[PDB]
Design a protein around this motif. Structure first.
Motif, short mmCIF file in Angstrom:
data_model
loop_
_atom_site.label_atom_id
_atom_site.label_comp_id
_atom_site.label_asym_id
_atom_site.label_seq_id
_atom_site.Cartn_x
_atom_site.Cartn_y
_atom_site.Cartn_z
N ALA A 179 -15.62 23.54 10.64
CA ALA A 179 -16.62 25.15 9.58
C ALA A 179 -15.96 24.57 8.19
O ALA A 179 -16.80 24.75 7.47
CB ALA A 179 -16.44 25.24 10.46
N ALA B 70 -19.82 21.34 14.92
CA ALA B 70 -19.96 21.76 13.49
C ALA B 70 -18.05 22.88 13.79
O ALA B 70 -17.78 22.97 12.87
CB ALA B 70 -20.96 22.73 13.97
N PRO B 71 -18.22 23.43 14.64
CA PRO B 71 -17.00 24.29 15.03
C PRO B 71 -15.16 23.28 13.74
O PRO B 71 -14.87 23.68 13.72
CB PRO B 71 -16.04 25.17 15.67
CG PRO B 71 -17.28 24.83 16.35
CD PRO B 71 -18.22 23.71 16.29
#
Ligand SMILES: CC(C)(COP(=O)(O)OP(=O)(O)OC[C@H]1O[C@@H](n2cnc3c(N)ncnc32)[C@H](O)[C@@H]1OP(=O)(O)O)[C@@H](O)C(=O)NCCC(=O)NCCS
Ligand SMILES: CCc1cccc(CC)c1NC(=O)NC(=N)NC
Ligand SMILES: [Mg+2]
Ligand SMILES: [Mg+2]
Ligand SMILES: [Mg+2]
Length: 221
Positions: free
Chosen positions: A34, A30-31
């Protein structure tokens, strides 16, 4: 599948032509997206779901696929692979490293290259010689570009060095029937690798089908 036409447990693949709704990245992934625009988030999530479907066939539990310093995917232990996304396509091919030294794949829409791009991705002999070895009216320029991309993706995990478009000479053949054939990429620069013997020739396959060019290189371990 489209990618099976360019492939020779020890090897697995999965592809999709859209982004299935409700797909999510793993928390570790996810990062990396993001702050990314929707189109980037979607292709990133879908191609990694394909990769996990392929890795599952080889006995590997679902794992995040992060990216290294030059953007290269980080595979689970003992695994190698390649990813590609373009309009209308997401694909992953993975291999068991004992039997498969490296994989590189690429997909592109089967369209003429935009003006000016051919000169930036080819060598003079390729522009002169490749049209005669390829079926008529197919976009040999786009196919050449895809072969250059699969070559770099198979090359980089083994060398961790740049490979320019002018650094590999690619020659093509066409199968007796249809819109498929083989290619050989000859590295013109030093092919020293992190381990094992140096790279000189990389043999791959190409295919045009359903408006897409697919290329793949699978180097035996
Ligand atoms: O064909 P594409 O350019 O779409 O392939 C993109 C993929 O190539 C892969 N890639 C990027 N840089 C790479 C490199 N140096 N070596 C190998 N593969 C690479 C990545 O997996 C990227 O997709 P991701 O950014 O979603 O992980
Ligand atoms: C301008 C090219 C480019 C931009 C962003 C991302 C990628 C994929 C790694 C690429 N392609 C390559 O660098 N190809 C390559 N060196 N072929 C021999
Ligand atoms: Mg892409
Ligand atoms: Mg590509
Ligand atoms: Mg199209």
């Amino acid at each position: 599948t489209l990618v099976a036409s360019v492939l020779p447990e020890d090897l697995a693949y999965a592809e999709l032509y859209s982004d299935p709704p409700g797909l999510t990245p793993l928390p570790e992934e996810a990062p990396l997206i993001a702050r990314s625009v929707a189109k980037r988030r979607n292709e990133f999530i879908t191609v990694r779901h394909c990769a996990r479907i392929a890795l599952d066939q080889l006995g590997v539990p679902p794992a995040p696929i992060l990216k290294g310093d030059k953007g290269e995917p980080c595979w689970p232990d003992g695994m190698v692979g390649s990813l590609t996304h373009c309009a209308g396509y997401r694909g992953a091919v993975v291999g068991r490293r004992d039997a498969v030294r490296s994989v590189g794949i690429d997909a592109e829409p089967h369209d003429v290259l935009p003006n000016g791009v051919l000169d930036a991705i080819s060598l003079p002999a390729e522009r002169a010689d490749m049209p005669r070895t390829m079926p008529a009216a197919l976009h040999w320029d786009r196919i050449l570009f895809c072969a250059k991309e699969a070559t770099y993706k198979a090359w980089f995990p083994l060398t961790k060095r740049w490979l320019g478009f002018e650094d590999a000479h690619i020659t093509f053949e066409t199968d007796s029937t249809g819109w498929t054939g083989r290619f050989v990429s000859r590295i013109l620069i030093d092919g020293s690798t992190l381990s094992g013997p140096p790279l000189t020739t990389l043999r791959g396959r190409w295919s045009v089908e359903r408006g897409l060019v697919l290329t793949a290189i699978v180097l035996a371990g």
